[PDB]
Amino acid sequence: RGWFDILDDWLKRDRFVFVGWSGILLFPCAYLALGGWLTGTTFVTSWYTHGLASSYLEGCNFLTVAVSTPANSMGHSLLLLWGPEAQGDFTRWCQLGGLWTFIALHGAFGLIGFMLRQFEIARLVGVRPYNAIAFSAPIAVFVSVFLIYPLGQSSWFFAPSFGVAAIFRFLLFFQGFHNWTLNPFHMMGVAGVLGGALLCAIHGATVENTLFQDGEGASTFRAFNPTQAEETYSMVTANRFWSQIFGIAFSNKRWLHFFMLFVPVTGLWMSAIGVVGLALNLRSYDFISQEIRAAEDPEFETFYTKNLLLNEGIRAWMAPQDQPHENFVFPEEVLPRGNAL
Amino acid sequence: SYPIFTVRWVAVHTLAVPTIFFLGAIAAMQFIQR
Amino acid sequence: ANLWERFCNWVTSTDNRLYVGWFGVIMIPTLLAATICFVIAFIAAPPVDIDGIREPVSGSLLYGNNIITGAVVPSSNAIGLHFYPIWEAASLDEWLYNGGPYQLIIFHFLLGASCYMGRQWELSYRLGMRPWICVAYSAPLASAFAVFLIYPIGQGSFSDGMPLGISGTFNFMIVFQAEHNILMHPFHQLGVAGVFGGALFCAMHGSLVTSSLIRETTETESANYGYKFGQEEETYNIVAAHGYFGRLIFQYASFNNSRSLHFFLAAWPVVGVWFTALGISTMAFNLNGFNFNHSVIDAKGNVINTWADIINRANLGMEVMHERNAHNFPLDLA
Amino acid sequence: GTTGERPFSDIITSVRYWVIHSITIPALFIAGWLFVSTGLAYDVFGTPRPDSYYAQEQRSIPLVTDRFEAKQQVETFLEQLK
Amino acid sequence: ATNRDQESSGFAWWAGNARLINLSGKLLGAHVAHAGLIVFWAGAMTLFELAHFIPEKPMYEQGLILIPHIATLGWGVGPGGEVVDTFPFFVVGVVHLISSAVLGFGGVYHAIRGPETLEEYSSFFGYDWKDKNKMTTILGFHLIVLGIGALLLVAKAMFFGGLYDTWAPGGGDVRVITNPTLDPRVIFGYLLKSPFGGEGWIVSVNNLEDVVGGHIWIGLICIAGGIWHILTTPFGWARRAFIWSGEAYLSYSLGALSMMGFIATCFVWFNNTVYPSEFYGPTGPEASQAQAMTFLIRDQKLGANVGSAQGPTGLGKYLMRSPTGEIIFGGETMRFWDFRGPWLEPLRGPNGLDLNKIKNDIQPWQERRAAEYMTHAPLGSLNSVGGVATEINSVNFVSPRSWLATSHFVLAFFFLVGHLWHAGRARAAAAGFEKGIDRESEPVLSMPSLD
Amino acid sequence: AELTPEVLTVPLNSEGKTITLTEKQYLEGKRLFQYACASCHVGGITKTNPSLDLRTETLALATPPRDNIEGLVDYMKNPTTYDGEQEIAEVHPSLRSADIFPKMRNLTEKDLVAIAGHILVEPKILGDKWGGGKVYY
Ligand code: CLA
Ligand code: CLA
Ligand code: CLA
Ligand code: CLA
Ligand SMILES: CC1=C(/C=C/C(C)=C/C=C/C(C)=C/C=C/C=C(C)/C=C/C=C(C)/C=C/C2=C(C)CCCC2(C)C)C(C)(C)CCC1
Ligand SMILES: CC1=C(/C=C/C(C)=C/C=C/C(C)=C/C=C/C=C(C)/C=C/C=C(C)/C=C/C2=C(C)CCCC2(C)C)C(C)(C)CCC1
Ligand SMILES: CC1=C(/C=C/C(C)=C/C=C/C(C)=C/C=C/C=C(C)/C=C/C=C(C)/C=C/C2=C(C)CCCC2(C)C)C(C)(C)CCC1
Ligand code: OEY
Ligand SMILES: [Cl-]
Ligand SMILES: [Cl-]
Ligand SMILES: [Fe+2]
């Protein structure tokens, strides 16, 4: 009954917002990541790091506001407030991109805290910690995309900026430079996400349309008591419907709900790996046999080669402004363009 | 007989009071002319 | 009974391994025609002048494609929205050149998938089920109509429909972004919320039911043997899964009604995908995504770029390179 | 059950609640408004005013090009503005 | 508490209008009050458009969808679609809006004050959804009303000043129609045209004679069907084929409205006869054709021989052949060679565009129309930045053809969803399992195993 | 940067006399140019004939010179080809053709001057972007 056991008691008290030991890590970091984003999109520019407006105060709307990444010349600096670049000057810190690493790092630790929170609450209630395990896929995505990818590149400049339109630019950068649609690791991630969404919809619709009549009203929602032992819908009729419509059906409810965990979780993990590849420019950019042929045979054309022409257009037309620190000067005459346009 | 200051109380006000502050800032922004 | 009644009983029989049904009577031949034509074309079809400019695009494996680059190529821009059955061509060779297999495949397939939707209703009625599974399928079905039919209609040509291929899909997506700023369109943003959220809620529900599985096995066997097909009892403690998930957030942010929980799982991705399909369907008529190009200017009048202007720079690179030989006149109006 | 706090339905319907917050909410709003309208938000965060993006005759962006002279660079650009 | 709560009616609040399925009086008030809202919106919106109308700007630069409907019927407009008197728009606006008050008064009266069920107050007005005889009678009355309404458009066109005719000689003009088309080979030939390119089913109707003619057929057919259903009751094959319930009737109409919504979408996008491009802006095909015309005219003025100019691909830069040989504009607009429009048909010969008319007979009004239509192509952004998606802000414009086609596709799609919803529910309801599977007689449990 | 009277000072005529506009006039000429001209001239290009733009160096080399308020007001009254050789009021909106180009009807001489001031001031602010087309977007 030492002071440690007494702090443990109060942290694990049943209250409206459970705290736990993991709250000490979670609540500060998640609040400061959140607040840093809200503060930055409201009040802070990207003028000196990017040559862009990026707050409401400058006249941006919700789609174009961002906490943008620090300038390329900062490298992978931690950009601590008391560090050598800002020297404690808060205003300078904002102007140099300090909010971006502020949000990225506090968010990294808030995510750790949230996963620990899932273990902590699971252990106290005595359930298996599969929801914590599922949360590894968001973590894998966050770390690969926001931390690993820029560490492989020249600087944090090329990480995602925290904004709706900023993320769209990132998407399109990844097409023009990395040919990321062509990457089998992104394709697996796509299948895992669209498959998760399929599983989500087909399972919910199947349960809603094989319910037993457990009440007398037309709103079927009131005929479920969370304490009841019986299944609320018919696994036997669902199984038959799908066996005859689609040829196969689930028969084992446990496997069914495990599969719902497995699919999206694996998808995101697979995309995480491909982004680690892209940190190194280890792209699936090309197909050598097709380039050999195309180079030799000016009548050979596929959708593969048409898309590389699109990529070359993205790179040339977007680099000068997207990478201002490079001082790209492209005369009109070197810009790639088809006829007329 | 409920408490009025709880952990929950701190939770909602840590969010709410900056939210309303920020709203007025954004409201005022709609009248900034270049 | 007479032969017609014998046939009607077979068609609607719930004893067939696969339900046939009246929708199935249309669905089976049209899907078989679409599938057989697709497999042959993907393997063997010769190049297709998709853009009507005598510049054939090779789509098939035998003509130098792999699984990722190969496609059934959309039919020629010279055809526009004209109907091009095999019997309108002067020879199979002419029909192959102008991309006839694309029309045959997509019309047979749209028709067959629409009956797939109907056939879901039909069996649900023979089984005594509630009928709305087919409503869920309408979201992927509507999305398919959008890319294969509605969008060609709005732009005037099946040559601007989505190719039947992996890289052809990407080509369609990139050109769509340049000409509509679909990323900046809220219906697509609703479709992303729909499928991200679907994947999340799929992971959540799966992880939560699994987390609260009742101990029914030893540690050496698969816990899946704790459920027996058709058992009356539930295999997990929903109260325990609520008690975990209620505390993870707060008590009322968590479902305790299994029926409300599952309707939420159905409704979320169905609605989002409805919207993104509506997004393609209305960008077919060139009501495009938000345009904020040069929306911010300073006291003098200089353009202060936002991230929207950077997106426009990339959009411009797709615009000026796509179909590089196809435009003679400065505006790309469809 | 209930973890012992007062229900939100109870509080927001209570008179004492709206007595307290008829003031706090609009005051917090006013303060945020004042934060922007005094021009104070520009100075705390260093956000350009509509007139201080470019010098009158320069079209180039004041982009920082050095890691440790960075803060020195941003100060020099702010004084070529005058 | 006559329904009005879940415990008695069986429906939750979010499905509460379903509490009215068997309260004919309260249901009547819902329909009339709703009709009030429809008439109200037609009233308010016209006045709004009228307040915001600047007769110097084209209608399609001003975000107008209702005034172009009134202009098409002949009122307020002169040669070339020029607005000559705005008073008829005011009249149309005020008269609907005044009407919405008497509609709303009747709706709110029947919904709140009047009898909740009509069946005891009068055998004529009350009904049971399952009375197959009463139902066809109500259908028959509404049929007659529709045929009358159809003939009102004939009356406007033949006896009350005519309709705006974009095709009318000399730039367009209002015109009395005196010889409507009655030849059923034409009128019903439209129903049998294929919907694909260059045919376009009934969307291809390109002259006021066919339009007025077809509305004479439809009005007479609707009046005959009104009588027919008033005097008949459904035959056995029809009795065995349908679900006879209130909700099933709803699903049927939802299906029909969906179908109509999709057709209207394509009507406004392709048809420039009953949606004159003078009022609605150029069609997509029309704008894209107008661009090739514009640069034919420019380059020919500099001395280009537009008929022999080989393009980059080998096809003609300005002129090529369609797949059946017609001479047509080149470039990507080759997909639009089915376009037909009053500004372009004067250059058409028996083989398509005529090189000699191109060399000699292009009037300045055609160069004006084609520049105008090309710079008003139906492209633009959600926030009404006109142009392609990569255009900078400046032009505040979205074509009303875009606005009308996008909205009615969305509406037609959601009504098809509503059809499937209510149709499937109506079938399940009628068979007795819309509330779920009976545990004590689960059907699948009484069926053989699939394998 | 800001909108100074130095920026708002444009050639009145070809004989080097200048006039100096106000903020209200510049905004007026932008609103009017949007309303009347931008459908073909957005950003200083010419969609229906990209070879002729609204660049000050281009208006300079027109016959007669068009890089001054009076020369532009004259163009909006009686537009000619680039070399002066031909009147084009029939296919270019002008006061002389306000019957066929109705958006010109309501315009007055002060409105034309506002539009001309906008066209002449705008490249002093945007530089290459004005009349440069999509390369500079
Ligand atoms: C709002 C309009 C409306 C509605 C809802 C009804 C509803 C009904 N009618 Mg009525 N009818 C109407 C208008 C309408 N009618 C008009 C205007 C006329 C005058 C011509 C008639 C003449 C009429 C007759 C003569 C009969 C009905 C009958 C019926 C009943 C069965 C109809 C049926 O089986 O569906 C249609 C279902 C079918 C299987 C029919 C074949 C459908 C094919 C596949 C469609 C394709 C051909 C199509 C008819 C025309 C081609 C157009 C195409 C290009 C799109 C039903 C209660 C029947 C009845 O019971 O009478 C008491 C009957 O015999 N109606
Ligand atoms: C959950 C709590 C938490 C966590 C994990 C972090 C984590 C972080 N913050 Mg945040 N921060 C927090 C709360 C937290 N903060 C709060 C409440 C505020 C409000 C004031 C801030 C305000 C803030 C600012 C303004 C900044 C950070 C920054 C940082 C980063 C660098 C910190 C650093 O270098 O540490 C250095 C300090 C330590 C490592 C602590 C050492 C601990 C002791 C002294 C070691 C000695 C122990 C002894 C030997 C043995 C004792 C044994 C025991 C039994 C007695 C890091 C990501 C910086 C950042 O994000 O830059 C990009 C930054 O600029 N934080
Ligand atoms: C077009 C819209 C529309 C219409 C016409 C109706 C009509 C109706 N509803 Mg539905 N309903 C709607 C939308 C609509 N609803 C929506 C969106 C919802 C979701 C929340 C519901 C949910 C719902 C439920 C849950 C229930 C109804 C019920 C009813 C019926 C009885 C209403 C009653 O007693 O209220 C009494 C209310 C009042 C007396 C308050 C006064 C409101 C009046 C009627 C409005 C007048 C305002 C207007 C400006 C009048 C001035 C004009 C005048 C000069 C002429 C009535 C026929 C009830 C029913 O079916 O009963 C069996 C019922 O239980 N509705
Ligand atoms: C289609 C809509 C509709 C329907 C079916 C009914 C039906 C009914 N109403 Mg209702 N009502 C409506 C609309 C409707 N009403 C509207 C719009 C108003 C507002 C004025 C009212 C106000 C109202 C009141 C205040 C009362 C009724 C009553 C009644 C009942 C007897 C009506 C009667 O006297 O008939 C007898 C038949 C006649 C008098 C023949 C003349 C009918 C009119 C004048 C012909 C007009 C035709 C018109 C040209 C068609 C075009 C209209 C429009 C498109 C321009 C009956 C159940 C009474 C009731 O139920 O008592 C409790 C009652 O007290 N209604
Ligand atoms: C960074 C930093 C920090 C922190 C800060 C913070 C903590 C902040 C916070 C802040 C915040 C916390 C803010 C908030 C805000 C909010 C807002 C801004 C909101 C708004 C919203 C809205 C707008 C909504 C609305 C809506 C919609 C839109 C739709 C639907 C409906 C609704 C109604 C919902 C410190 C100090 C450490 C220092 C260092 C730096
Ligand atoms: C039942 C119900 C409901 C519904 C309601 C409704 C639907 C109604 C409607 C109503 C209506 C529908 C109404 C109407 C109104 C109208 C009016 C009120 C009008 C008036 C007008 C006037 C007065 C005009 C004037 C003028 C003139 C003459 C000239 C120009 C100027 C002006 C415009 C000013 C709800 C949902 C709520 C809830 C539940 C129950
Ligand atoms: C006015 C006009 C015109 C004319 C039109 C007409 C004359 C119309 C007709 C139309 C018609 C004549 C229509 C009809 C329709 C039909 C339908 C829409 C049907 C449907 C059916 C159903 C839906 C059925 C179903 C079923 C089945 C299939 C099986 C058994 C069961 C049941 C019965 C359910 C024209 C274009 C010249 C020009 C412009 C104006
Ligand atoms: O993008 Mn751009 O726009 Ca719709 O067409 Mn005109 O060019 Mn071409 O044929 Mn495929 O695609
Ligand atoms: Cl392309
Ligand atoms: Cl072209
Ligand atoms: Fe489940």
Numbering used by the authors:
A (entry chain d): 12 to 352
B (entry chain f): 12 to 45
C (entry chain a): 11 to 344
D (entry chain e): 3 to 84
E (entry chain c): 23 to 473
F (entry chain v): 1 to 137
Can you quote the paper on this entry?
In natural photosynthesis, the light-driven splitting of water into electrons, protons and molecular oxygen forms the first step of the solar-to-chemical energy conversion process. The reaction takes place in photosystem II, where the Mn4CaO5 cluster first stores four oxidizing equivalents, the S0 to S4 intermediate states in the Kok cycle, sequentially generated by photochemical charge separations in the reaction center and then catalyzes the O–O bond formation chemistry. Here, we report room temperature snapshots by serial femtosecond X-ray crystallography to provide structural insights into the final reaction step of Kok’s photosynthetic water oxidation cycle, the S3→[S4]→S0 transition where O2 is formed and Kok’s water oxidation clock is reset. Our data reveal a complex sequence of events, which occur over micro- to milliseconds, comprising changes at the Mn4CaO5 cluster, its ligands and water pathways as well as controlled proton release through the hydrogen-bonding network of the Cl1 channel.
